[PDB]
Every structure is written in C-alpha cells, then in structure tokens.
Design a protein around this ligand. Structure first.
Ligand SMILES: OC[C@H]1O[C@@H](O[C@H]2[C@H](O)[C@H](O)[C@H](O)O[C@@H]2CO)[C@@H](O)[C@@H](O)[C@@H]1O
Ligand SMILES: [Zn+2]
Ligand SMILES: [Zn+2]
Ligand SMILES: [Zn+2]
Ligand SMILES: [Zn+2]
Ligand SMILES: [Zn+2]
Ligand SMILES: [Zn+2]
Ligand SMILES: [Zn+2]
Ligand SMILES: [Zn+2]
Ligand SMILES: [Zn+2]
Ligand SMILES: [Zn+2]
Ligand SMILES: [Zn+2]
Ligand SMILES: [Zn+2]
Ligand SMILES: [Zn+2]
Ligand SMILES: [Zn+2]
Length: 428
C-alpha cells in the first residue's frame, strides 16, 4: 500500500519531505479541539507548530460528532477524500485494503509503543494517538461527602460506595452517558486485562473460549461477567441517572467538575476534559476499575485511536501524511497534553493522572499466537458482539434490561455466550 518507498523509521523530521507542497485532510473524533474555545491546545495550535517545521504541508482538520460511524462510511467509499483518519472498527485482516503500512512491525517496535496493536501479516498500519488506560473518573469531594475512606477495589465495595453517594450526597453516583454509543461501548475496555490480570486474555483466551461471559466460579467478582454486572447492578440499584434516554455527554463534563456526578467509567483521556470543564479541577480523580485479581489490581494500557493513512492517495500525500503522523507522535506533545502516555518508544514519561495507580500492575495486550492474529476480529464479526470494536448497542441493552427488570445479568450474559460460542466453533 505504501507508494512512497519510505518507511516511518526512515523519516528524518525536518529534513525528509521538505520539498513537498500539498494539502492533506485529517479526520478525527476530537470535535472539541476543532473549536477556538477549546480550554487546551487545539488543532489549530498543533498545526501551527507543525507548520513551523513543514510550512508547505497544509493540514485540513475534519471532525465529526458521530465519529466511528462517519469514518467507517468514508472508508467504505474507497476514495481519496481523506488522507489520515483515526482507524475505526476494521478487521485487522482488512487493514491492507485501506491503509498504508508504516513499516515492518518488528522495525516499528523500535520507535513506537503498541506497534502490534494495529498490525497484520507483520506490518503496522496504525500508530496510537496516545496510550490510555481504562479506569473510573470520580469526584473526590463527592467521595469525601459520602464518607468513602478508601477507593473501592471489588464490585461489592463499589456498589456499597454508590449507595453511600446516593444516600448522603446530591450527585448521580454513576452517570452512564447511555446516549453516546462510544461511552457505552467503553465498558468492553475493562473485561480482559483489567478483569483477569492476563495480558493474553483479549487476543488469545477470549476468541478461543466458548462462553467467556459466564460468571467465574472460583472468582465471581472477576472476569468479564463482573464488569457487565457492575453496570447492570448500578442501574438496577437505582444508582444511575433518572433517565438514561436523555443523558448528555458535553454537560456531563461540567457536572462531574461541579460534583453533580460522582463517577463515570471512562478512560484516562477523560481526566483533562473533566478538569477543564469547570472551576474544581482538583476535585477530579482517577481510579482503577474496582476489580481485584488474586489480590492485585490491573490496568491495560492501549491506544485510544490510531492514525491510519489512505492507501488510495498519491505518493506525495502518503509521505506528507506519514510526516505529520510522525510529527504528532514524536514532537507535537499531544499525549502530554491530553493526559496520556507518549507513544515514541523511548519516552517513558507518564501523565500525573497515574497517582492512585502506584500498586496497580500496568499491562498491555499480548499478541495472539502466530497465525491467530485475525481470530478475535473474526469471532467478533461472526458473533455480532463487537467486543471492544464499536458495538455499544449491546451495552445499552444492559442498561435497558436492568432498568426495566426484563432480564437478569445472567440471562443477558447467557445470550451473548451462545452467540459467541457458535462463533468460536466456526473459527476454530
Ligand atoms: O479520544 C477519546 C474519546 O473521545 C470521544 O469523543 C469525544 C471527545 O473526546 C470530546 O469529548 C468531544 O467533545 O466529544 C466527543 C464525542 O463526540 C470518543 O470518540 C471516544 O471513543 C474516544 O475514546
Ligand atoms: Zn455522539
Ligand atoms: Zn453510532
Ligand atoms: Zn479477519
Ligand atoms: Zn524483517
Ligand atoms: Zn497472513
Ligand atoms: Zn477524608
Ligand atoms: Zn467503600
Ligand atoms: Zn438504609
Ligand atoms: Zn445511539
Ligand atoms: Zn480465567
Ligand atoms: Zn465559577
Ligand atoms: Zn472544589
Ligand atoms: Zn440480543
Ligand atoms: Zn469444536
């Protein structure tokens, strides 16, 4: 797919491509950063900084509120109307049908983190925008008002804390952001490394296990079941917003900052957005998801959204785009600014958000065994469950079922297991 003859490690920022005069279109999900009133460093500011180094590469930013859906639509049009996008929910095995390979994955791992996350048949097709963990954003002042002494570490402790918040404060204990598909889909981010302690769970165990959503007999407070039951119980116990059908994401930021919401299950990228949303940044904290595995808590570090380059575009625009991605990765400061972990391989600096995480084991998803790279994507597709790959609708169903008492969490998990179990069988 690479028309340029140049791999990503071969780019010398400030020297390579300096003769290029072109314009590239950069599609991303950060509508907030596409505004002049963004409380932080917005897209225009980054592009200005980039243009000091490459003045003749003009970068045009396009942002969509319904990002996942609109990016996939543009991808399936198979044209040259975009040059860089954040990779949406695409089968790894289909990367080469859409995206320029940055380079051999073994070479990329020398210069970026998470080089095998968006890779296939030995090539890397996406670079993460920053490394994030999945945890819980919480308001420390609301927790103090509720009398919560220590952060909850099990589902039972969490529900006990939500009840204290409900009874003793005025905050919504857990705000679901039901209306945002991506906010509901985020619950899939906790069910593997966080809920099991096993870096191989996501890419090896899950797609080879017929009923992964069943309760774990030995440790019923762990594994994916415990995650989805956390959401189920919080809604069924009356510890979420009165009306899930009318939640609002943008106002939820200000409400967290001002102590009207106590918790939201979101990745670390959300911490600066909550802190910027009002006068009480110091009241925003970040905690591990409340599962303990054999006495230890775990948090997976993963890419939030990865940059991919359109294989359909000219060699000039492919190279211009790869220069901008490398600039974003190595020079921009995006990760330092959005509260995430830098992706340049040799940068071991960490957001200050990781201070309730001193005893947490930070892990990354191991690749599948050789030849199984595509197994999760294929079981996911055939099951129609879209685990960690776009499907927030099934999580909305958890909220609906728990609020209307139509089904128990067991029954919901049993439905998923039967669909997954067939997909595991069909792909073995
Ligand atoms: O990239 C982090 C998450 O962004 C989310 O989109 C938000 C965005 O962060 C910002 O808050 C904007 O104001 O609203 C967007 C939703 O329209 C989602 O894309 C999510 O999937 C990302 O993980
Ligand atoms: Zn939306
Ligand atoms: Zn959608
Ligand atoms: Zn596939
Ligand atoms: Zn090689
Ligand atoms: Zn192959
Ligand atoms: Zn106290
Ligand atoms: Zn407690
Ligand atoms: Zn009571
Ligand atoms: Zn929706
Ligand atoms: Zn297990
Ligand atoms: Zn004020
Ligand atoms: Zn305050
Ligand atoms: Zn169903
Ligand atoms: Zn079989």
């Amino acid at each position: 797919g690479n028309k340029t003859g140049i791999t990503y490690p071969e780019i010398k920022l400030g020297e390579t491509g300096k003769d290029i005069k072109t314009t590239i279109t950069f599609m991303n999900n950060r509508t907030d950063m596409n505004l002049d009133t963004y409380p932080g460093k917005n897209w225009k500011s980054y592009i200005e900084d980039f243009n000091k180094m490459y003045p003749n590469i003009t970068v045009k930013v396009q942002t969509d509120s319904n990002y996942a859906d609109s990016a996939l639509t543009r991808l399936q049009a198979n044209n040259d109307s975009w040059d860089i996008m954040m990779i949406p929910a695409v089968d790894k095995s289909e990367f080469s049908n859409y995206f320029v390979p940055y380079g051999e994955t073994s070479e990329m791992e020398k210069v970026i983190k998470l080089a095998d996350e968006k890779a296939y048949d030995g090539q890397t097709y996406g670079i993460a925008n920053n490394g994030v963990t999945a945890g819980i954003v919480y308001n420390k002042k609301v927790f103090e008002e509720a009398g919560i002494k220590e952060l909850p570490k099990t589902p039972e402790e969490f529900q006990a804390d939500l009840k204290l918040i409900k009874e003793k404060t005025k905050a919504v204990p857990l705000y679901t952001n039901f209306v945002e598909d991506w906010a509901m889909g985020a619950w899939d981010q906790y069910i593997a490394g966080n809920a099991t302690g096993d870096p191989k769970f996501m890419n090896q165990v899950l797609p080879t296990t017929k009923e992964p959503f069943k309760k774990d007999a030995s440790a019923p407070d762990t594994h994916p079941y415990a995650v989805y039951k956390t959401l189920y119980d919080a809604v069924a116990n009356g510890y979420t917003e009165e009306d899930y059908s009318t939640t609002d994401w943008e106002s939820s930021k200000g409400k967290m900052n001002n102590g009207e919401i106590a918790t939201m299950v979101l990745g670390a990228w959300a911490v600066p957005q909550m802190k910027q949303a009002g006068d009480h940044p110091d009241d925003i904290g970040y905690m591990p998801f409340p599962i303990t595995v054999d006495g230890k808590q775990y948090a997976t570090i993963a890419g939030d959204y990865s940059y991919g380059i359109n294989k359909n575009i000219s060699k000039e625009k492919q190279e211009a785009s790869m220069i901008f991605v490398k600039w974003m990765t190595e020079d921009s400061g995006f990760a330092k600014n959005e509260g995430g972990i830098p992706i340049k391989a040799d940068d071991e600096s960490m957001p200050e958000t990781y201070e309730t995480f001193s005893d947490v084991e930070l892990i990354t998803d191991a690749p599948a065994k050789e030849g199984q790279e595509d197994l999760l994507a294929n079981v996911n597709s055939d099951s129609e469950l879209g685990i960690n790959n776009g499907n927030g609708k099934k999580i909305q169903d958890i909220v609906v079922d728990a609020a209307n008492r139509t089904r128990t969490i067991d029954q919901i998990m049993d439905e998923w297991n039967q669909k997954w179990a067939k997909a595991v069988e069909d792909n073995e």
